[PDB]
Structure formats: structure tokens, C-alpha cells
């Protein structure tokens, strides 16, 4: 009946404790053996390794490699699972959501907070949840973690130790899995194929992400643009503004918004940015700063890199960023 | 019996909806009137305004002004309440925790997610919780929000809309308030005066905070040091490392850690950083990067600014950052 491809990339799920600390050492065949994963029963699992990478530290070039491999596999597989490091899982899931347009199959990313060989490892549970969801007659890019299925472009890693490490940010979970029971939280009907798969791996990697902090000077904006960076993401305040008083930050940004996309997201985790609610937000908007609305940091960053691969025109970037491609952002 | 000082600074709690959006318009007398706050019954509340500031957008100079005003008030008051904007509440609470050593009285910061004049405003509830805790025979810097009392140097704003907007990060709450009932979560005995109050407002404001993202180049480190910044905070990965492969970020940091403190915190909210667990973390540590351990971003940033006001020696900064002054960091 079904054919699944499991793609290994390294990560904690591929790691073992050594004298040098945790080290990515396992190929996908060893992961599946050590996590006691069934390779058959109404399906056949095939496996493969993305060579010379470790998704403990994913590089954007790896996104292009993974996107090309996943896109080729769509022909030959009913479902695709990617095992990946947790720290950038959400970035890969988000970038794949923009690089693979209208996947006609489930692409499910997972990892583990614990190596397989550590006591109470989450790796077997998460691989099994990913396999169960990849066998569903659905399409899109998802993350399987701690029995949840989440839209990939809505996931963030919220903690560094706890097993419930991934959350859907400002968006419902897709589903919850209890064994052979899949409970759809958004209707299965909303994840059906709709148009033909397209591969688009264009991107500009020089996006810099700053936390907005009290006293942060406009000198930092001069510095990153002199370092030749092409987009700026600000982890800003809920009011969505920047100071005019005792500060050149807003005035130095207003000078460069005609030529450089400056995106306002939040340092806070939940509920997004609304630059209209406060006078300070409206002042920021009137400088040509682009609101990230309800997007994750991971979606904002990957989307802008992808957007800048297409155009240097800031109005076109503004339109791309506010286009809802795959439910990464509210309409 | 008791004397309390309520200090107004602006913020959402001082704001009203205008045609220009929310605007900070209310002095503390109007806040207390509009939130129907009792000014007596076993206490007397006096009030005052920090002039020519709006804590919607706090500036570090305002920290020095507030610290000096609060420190003077310790003589004449049993308790001190500061009403403040929510977006930088946690930064002011953390910086006051370093600038006012051994306060011999409760200093309680609060604000509101809603203006007083909006339906279902949290402002009255939060002011009342702050007053109840400021009447306790305790000492320290606390935040009152949504019936919780939290250690100031452990608070972060976690969301932009929800009323339960502040959390104690990697540390228990101090107390929970149900009316005239205060339930201590950490024993009241642990917040007693211990040595004489000292004021220390030295700080260096040029700290820049970067999110670690895939492909972020060492060119950004050259840029911020050429802009004359004196400390770098990295919102890094749970594994606590930075790439050597297809990257000069770690190698460019290793060049400047002898002269510039580079602090590793997390982009994730909960559970802190452990640079020993992974080989990639140990490689980062061996470059002279300073771990923030379990500290909030708000404590890390304010502590480093305060640390850099005292010394330019990176070993002395490393020792200051890992000194547990007021339970901002694990020992």
C-alpha cells in the first residue's frame, strides 16, 4: 500500500552522549534501528541521509538541498518525514513552506529533545507520530512533536529542556495523535492538494535580526547596512513603536525603509503585533516599517530571505510579506 | 499606620484611546481616580510623577532618574509602587534590582494591558495587587500582574494582548494574592532586609542584542564593534553553539571575546542555556563566550549594561554576570 521516505539531517535525534558532550553520529538507518521503528505493515519505509550536513547547525544552503531532495521524492512517495535538530526545525519547516509550493503530499519534520540512547527519549514517540501523520491523505509541511501535528510555518521552539518544546503560535494545531487515532483540530478537508507542485529555492541570506532594547541607537542600522545586509527584522514591543525622544533609531530607519525592508515582529512570544493600536505604532508605520502581524520569528525571517531572493523593491517585499501563501500570516 | 508612595511613569496604564490611537495622557492622580483606588484604611497613599518621561518607551537615563527617586523615598515610605508601560516593565524592574542594592522595603512595579477607560481593564486589579504586596513586611523589587507577585529580575512579558502577560522565567513566583489573602510561594522569611541600602546607577548603554539565525555572518560582529558597541547579547540555540562550517561567526567572535563581553542567552523562552551538554556548546565556551545560564533576556541585558558601567575587563564582566546578586541567576 503506502511508500514513505524518511530523510536524516543530523540533530539531537541523530546524537549520542560522548566524552566531548552530545555529538551528531547516527545515520537514519541507525536512528530507526535504535528507536525500534517498524519499517512495514500497510506501508514500506525507505530512508536516506542528506550528506555532509548536521541540522544541529542548519545553513540556508541546506534548505535548498533539502527542498530539491523532498521535491524529487514527491513523485515516488505517499509521505515524507525529515528528522532534524530542534533548534532550527521551525526555520527549515517555514523555509520549505515557501520553497515547495503546493506539495501534493505530507512533508512531516520532527526531532527529539533527548538522544535515542538517553533514558525516557522522546525520539521513538516523535518518529512514530510523524509516520502516522505522513500516512494521512493530506498535503502540506507539518511538524510532529509531543503527540501534536502543527503547521510548519506556525511552529516555534519555546523551551530548551522540556519535551513539550514546540508550539503553534497564534494558530490552532492541525491535529492530535493518540496511537492509530488522529483527531483533526483543523478539518482534514482544508489540507487537500490544490494546484501542481512548484519548486522555488531563490533566497537572499543577509537578513539580520535585532532585539529592540532601551537605548538601542540608529548607529546599529548604519553598521548592518555598511556590512551589506539586505533586510532587518526587529523583535519589537507590543505597542509596535520606536523612540523619537533621546533616540535616532526611528529617524535612521525612516532614512533606509525606501531601499531596505525593515520588519516589525515582537520580542514577546504570543498574540502578534498591531502597529495601529498605539500612537507610537502609527508613527513607526508612517516611516515605512513593515508589520509581521501574527507571524512567527521563524516564518518572518525565512519569508523575508525568500522574498529578497525575488526582488529588491521594498513595496514588492511589503506585498510578499502580507500575502498569505500557506497560513503563515493572517490575510 | 503605613505610608505608600505610588510613582507614575506613563505607559498603557496612563493611556486613553484617542483618534491618534492609544496615547499616554494621565498623571498618577488621574490613574488612581479613574481606577477607583482607595487612598486610605490602615495606610495613606501619596503619589508623584516622574516628569518628562513615558515608560511606553523607557530610556536607560530614566532608570537612573527612577532609581534616585525610589532610593530617596525609602526613608519616608513603608512601600513603593511604580506604574509603568508593560513592554519594558521587566527591563526597569531588572535594572532597579542592580541599581538599588539591599532595598529595605518592597518596590512593586505594575501596569496594565488595557487602559483604565477600556472595558474590562486590568489596571484597577493590578494597582490593588501592587498596593496589597507593598503593605507586606518584605524587601526587594517585585512585579504585580494578574494576581501574581514575581521577582522583578525574573519577569518577561510573554504576550502582546492576553491579560496574563508576565511570567516568572525559570524561577518560582514569590506569591499569589486573592483579596486580603497573600499566599507566599517562596517563604516571606526569604525577603527580609539584610544589610543597608546602597545606590549604584553606573551603566554603559551600548549593548546590542542579536537573534542567532542560520547564515548570520561574522560581518555583523565587525559592524557593531565598528559602531562602537561595548557588549553583545546573542539570543542563541538550546545547544548553545554557533557554526564553524560555512561560517565565520564563531571565528570572528573568538577574535573579539578578549576585549568585548559576548553573552549567550536563548531565543527560546524557558529552561535557560547549558553550553556544556553539546559538543557545539563546549566549542562556543572555549571561544570565551559568557553563558547567561537561566537569566531572562531582560536581566541579562540590564545586568551587562550595569556590569560594563563598572569595568571593561571581560574576566571581571564574566565574574559579575555569574555572581547571583538578587536571584536573577542560579549560583
Q: What is the C-alpha separation between A67 and A73, in angstroms, rounded?
A: 10
Residues A305 and A265 in one domain: yes
E runs forming strands in A161-287: 166-168, 175-178, 181-184, 198-199, 207-211, 231-236, 262-266
Residues B187 and B249 in one domain: no
Given A22, A157, A237, which is nearest B278 (Cβ)? A22
Chain B contact probe: residue of A239, A242, A247, A274 with most B CBs at under 10 A: A239
Nearest CA in chain B to A265: B160
Are A288 and A235 a contacting pair, CB within 8 Å? no
Q: Tell me the CA distances in angstroms from B228 to A194, B7, B109, one per residue in order.
A: 52, 35, 33
Secondary element (H or E) of residue B127: helix B123-134
Resolution in A: 1.9
Residues B240 and B192 in one domain: no
Q: Does B118 touch chain A (CB under 8 A)?
A: no
Alpha helices in A135-246, H assignment, sequence order: 219-226
Q: Strand pairing partners for A5? A: A46, A80
Q: Edge-to-edge strands of the sheet including A148-151?
A: A43-49, A2-8, A79-83, A106-110, A140-145, A148-151, A175-178, A181-184
Q: Report long-range pairs for A199-202 (Cβ below 8 Å, ≥24 apart).
A: A199/A67, A199/A68, A199/A71, A199/A99, A199/A100, A199/A101, A200/A98, A200/A99, A200/A101, A200/A306, A201/A63, A201/A64, A201/A67, A201/A68, A201/A99, A202/A306, A202/A309, A202/A310
Q: What is the C-alpha separation between A314 and A312, in angstroms, rounded?
A: 6
Q: What is the C-alpha separation between A241 and A292, in angstroms, rounded?
A: 13
Q: Does A158 touch chain B (CB under 8 A)?
A: yes
DSSP state of B289: P
Q: Does B247 touch chain A (CB under 8 A)?
A: yes
Q: What is the C-alpha separation between A229 and A231, in angstroms, rounded?
A: 6
Residues B187 and B286 in one domain: no
* SS3 letters across A28-87: HHHHHHHCCCCCECCEEEEEEECCCCCHHHCCHHHHHHHHHHHHHHCCCCCEEEEECCHH
Q: Which three cell numbers stand for residue A304?
A: 523575508
Secondary element (H or E) of residue B68: helix B60-73
Q: What is the C-alpha separation between B265 and B262, in angstroms, rounded?
A: 10
Q: Tell me the CA distances in angstroms from A64 to A100, B13, B38, B169, one per residue in order.
A: 10, 48, 63, 36
Residue B104 class from Cβ within 10 Å (0-12 exposed, 13-18 middle, 19+ buried)?
middle
Q: Does A220 touch chain B (CB under 8 A)?
A: yes
What percent helix, strand, coil does chain B show, rounded to 5?
Answer: 30, 25, 45
Rg (CA), chain B: 20
Residues A186 and A214 in one domain: no
* Inside any domain, residue A328: no
Are A91 and A302 a contacting pair, CB within 8 Å? yes
A12 is catalytic: yes
Q: Which of B235, B239, B219, B238 is nearest to B227 (CA)?
A: B219
Given B86, B162, B276, which is nearest A21 (Cβ)? B276
* Cβ within 8 Å, pair A60-B214: yes
Q: Which of B155, B171, B199 is the last residue of a domain?
A: B199
Residues B146 and B193 in one domain: yes
Q: Edge-to-edge strands of the sheet including B2-8?
A: B43-49, B2-8, B79-83, B106-110, B140-145, B148-151, B175-178, B181-184
* Cβ within 8 Å, pair B214-A274: no
Q: What is the C-alpha separation between A123 and A28, in angstroms, rounded?
A: 12
Residues B254 and B293 in one domain: yes
Q: What is the C-alpha separation between A193 and A182, in angstroms, rounded?
A: 19
B-contacting residues in A 45-64 (Cβ below 8 Å): 54, 56-61, 63
Q: Which of B286, B230, B289 is nearest to B265 (CA)?
A: B289
Q: Which of A125, A142, A124 is nearest to A133 (CA)?
A: A142
Neighbours of A120 (CB within 10 A): 7
Residues A187 and A221 in one domain: no
A-contacting residues in B 263-292 (Cβ below 8 Å): 266-274, 276-282
Nearest CA in chain A to B204: A215
* Inside any domain, residue B329: no
Q: What is the C-alpha separation between B294 and B272, in angstroms, rounded?
A: 4
Q: Which three cell numbers stand for residue B183?
A: 499566599
Q: What is the C-alpha separation between A198 and A172, in angstroms, rounded?
A: 26
Residue A322 class from Cβ within 10 Å (0-12 exposed, 13-18 middle, 19+ buried)?
middle
The CATH code of the domain that includes B151 is: 3.40.50.1170
Q: Does B331 touch chain A (CB under 8 A)?
A: no
* Cβ within 8 Å, pair B87-A237: yes
* Cβ within 8 Å, pair A215-B160: no
Residues B166 and B240 in one domain: no
* Cβ within 8 Å, pair A211-B85: no
**Chain B residues lying within 8 Å of A241, measured CB to CB:** 56-57
Residues B17 and B136 in one domain: yes
Q: How many contacts (CB atoms, under 8 Å) link A and B?
A: 222
What percent helix, strand, coil does chain A show, rounded to 5?
Answer: 30, 25, 45
Q: Does B33 touch chain A (CB under 8 A)?
A: no
Nearest CA in chain B to A166: B268
Q: What is the C-alpha separation between B89 and B33, in angstroms, rounded?
A: 22
* Inside any domain, residue B331: no
Query: Residue A177, SS3?
Result: strand
* Inside any domain, residue A331: no
CA distance B229 to chain A (A): 8
Query: Which residues are CB-contacts of A27 (< 8 A; sequence separation ≥ 6)?
Result: A8, A14, A49
Are B60 and B305 a contacting pair, CB within 8 Å? yes
Quote the domain boundaries for residue A85. 2-199
Q: Which three cell numbers stand for residue B27?
A: 498623571
Q: Which three cell numbers stand for residue B71?
A: 532610593
Residues of B forming the active site = 12, 86
Q: Which three cell numbers stand for residue A221?
A: 542600522
Q: Strand pairing partners for A166? A: A157
**Chain A residues lying within 8 Å of B270, measured CB to CB:** 158-162
Are A148 and A126 a contacting pair, CB within 8 Å? no
Given B209, B224, B266, which is nearest A160 (Cβ)? B266
Q: Does A331 touch chain B (CB under 8 A)?
A: no
Secondary element (H or E) of residue B211: strand B207-211
Only one residue has cell 549560583, namely B331
* Inside any domain, residue B95: yes
Q: Which of B145, B151, B152 is nearest to B172 (CA)?
A: B151
Q: What is the C-alpha separation between B86 and B64, in angstroms, rounded?
A: 19
CA distance A76 to chain B (A): 30
Q: What is the C-alpha separation between A4 and A134, in angstroms, rounded?
A: 7
CA dihedral B220, B226, B227, B231 (to 10 degrees): 70
Q: Which three cell numbers stand for residue B267?
A: 531565543
Nearest CA in chain B to A235: B211
**Chain B residues lying within 8 Å of A297, measured CB to CB:** 211, 267
Q: Which of A48, A64, A60, A61 is nearest to A9 (CA)?
A: A48
Q: What is the C-alpha separation between A1 and A144, in angstroms, rounded?
A: 23
CA dihedral A272, A275, A280, A285 (to 10 degrees): 130
Residues A117 and A137 in one domain: yes
Q: What is the C-alpha separation between B41 and B26, in angstroms, rounded?
A: 25
Largest CA distance in chain A: 67
Q: Residues preceding discontinuities in chain B at C–N > 2.5 Å?
A: none
Residue A222 class from Cβ within 10 Å (0-12 exposed, 13-18 middle, 19+ buried)?
middle
Q: Does B310 touch chain A (CB under 8 A)?
A: no
Are A43 and A100 a contacting pair, CB within 8 Å? no
Are A22 and A12 a contacting pair, CB within 8 Å? yes
Q: What is the C-alpha separation between A129 and A148, in angstroms, rounded?
A: 8
Q: Which of A330, A298, A130, A100 is nearest to A193 (CA)?
A: A100
Q: Which of A166, A199, A232 is the last residue of a domain?
A: A199
Query: Residue A144, SS3?
Result: strand
Residues A249 and A214 in one domain: yes
Secondary element (H or E) of residue A299: helix A297-308
Query: Residue B8, SS3?
Result: strand
Query: Which residues are CB-contacts of A286 (< 8 A; sequence separation ≥ 6)?
Result: none
* Inside any domain, residue B330: no
Q: Please report, for chain A, how many H helices and E strands are present, in that order.
A: 9, 18
* Inside any domain, residue A327: no
Q: Does A241 touch chain B (CB under 8 A)?
A: yes
Q: What is the C-alpha separation between B285 and B268, in angstroms, rounded?
A: 19
Q: Which of A289, A236, A306, A257 is nearest to A91 (CA)?
A: A306
* Inside any domain, residue B327: no
Q: Which of B199, B229, B249 is the last residue of a domain?
A: B199
Are B308 and B230 a contacting pair, CB within 8 Å? yes
CA B292 to mean position of chain CA atoms: 15
Q: Strand pairing partners for A78? A: none
Chain B contact probe: residue of A209, A214, A248, A301 with most B CBs at under 10 A: A214
CA A292 to mean position of chain CA atoms: 15
Given B58, B211, B235, which is nearest A214 (Cβ)? B58
Number of domains composing chain A: 2
Are A98 and A307 a contacting pair, CB within 8 Å? no
Are A81 and A13 a contacting pair, CB within 8 Å? no
The CATH code of the domain that includes A266 is: 3.40.50.40
Amino acid at each position: 500500500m503506502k511508500k514513505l521516505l524518511i530523510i536524516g539531517t543530523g540533530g539531537t535525534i541523530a546524537s549520542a552522549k560522548t566524552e566531548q558532550g552530545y555529538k551528531s553520529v547516527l545515520k537514519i538507518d541507525e536512528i530507526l534501528k535504535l528507536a525500534k521503528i517498524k519499517l512495514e505493515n500497510g506501508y514500506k519505509i525507505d530512508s536516506t541521509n542528506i550528506m555532509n550536513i548536521d541540522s544541529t547547525l542548519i545553513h540556508p544552503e541546506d534548505w535548498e538541498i533539502i527542498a530539491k531532495e523532498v521535491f524529487k521524492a514527491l513523485d515516488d512517495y505517499d509521505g515524507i518525514i525529515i528528522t532534524h535538530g530542534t533548534d532550527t526545525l521551525a526555520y527549515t519547516a517555514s523555509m520549505l513552506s515557501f520553497m515547495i509550493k503546493n506539495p501534493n503530499k505530507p512533508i512531516v519534520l520532527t526531532g527529539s529533545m533527548l538522544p535515542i540512547t538517553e533514558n525516557g527519549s522522546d525520539a521513538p514517540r516523535n518518529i512514530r507520530t510523524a509516520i502516522k501523520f505522513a500516512m494521512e491523505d493530506v498535503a502540506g509541511v507539518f511538524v510532529a512533536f509531543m503527540d501534536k501535528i502543527m503547521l510548519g510555518c506556525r511552529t516555534s521552539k519555546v523551551r530548551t529542556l522540556g519535551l513539550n518544546a514546540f508550539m503553534s503560535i497564534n494558530y490552532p494545531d492541525v491535529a492530535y495523535v493518540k496511537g492509530e487515532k488522529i483527531l483533526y483540530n483543523i478539518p482534514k478537508e482544508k489540507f487537500q492538494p490544490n494546484g501542481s507542485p512548484e519548486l522555488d529555492t531563490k533566497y537572499e541570506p543577509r537578513v539580520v535580526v535585532l532585539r529592540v532594547t532601551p537605548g538601542l541607537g540608529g548607529e546599529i542600522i548604519d553598521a548592518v547596512l555598511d556590512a551589506g545586509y539586505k533586510g532587518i527584522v526587529l523583535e519589537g514591543y507590543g505597542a509596535g513603536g520606536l523612540p523619537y525622544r533621546k533616540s535616532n533609531l526611528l529617524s535612521k530607519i525612516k532614512e533606509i525603509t525606501p531601499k531596505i525592508p525593515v520588519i516589525m515582529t515582537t520580542q514577546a512570544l504570543y498574540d502578534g503585533v498591531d502597529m495601529r493600536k498605539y500612537e507610537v505604532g502609527r508613527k513607526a508605520l508612517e516611516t515605512g516599517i513593515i508589520p509581521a502581524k501574527d507571524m512567527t520569528k521563524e516564518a518572518t525571517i525565512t519569508k523575508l530571505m525568500w522574498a529578497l531572493g525575488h526582488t529588491k523593491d521594498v513595496e514588492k517585499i511589503r506585498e510578499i510579506m502580507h500575502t498569505n501563501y500557506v497560513n503563515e500570516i493572517k490575510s
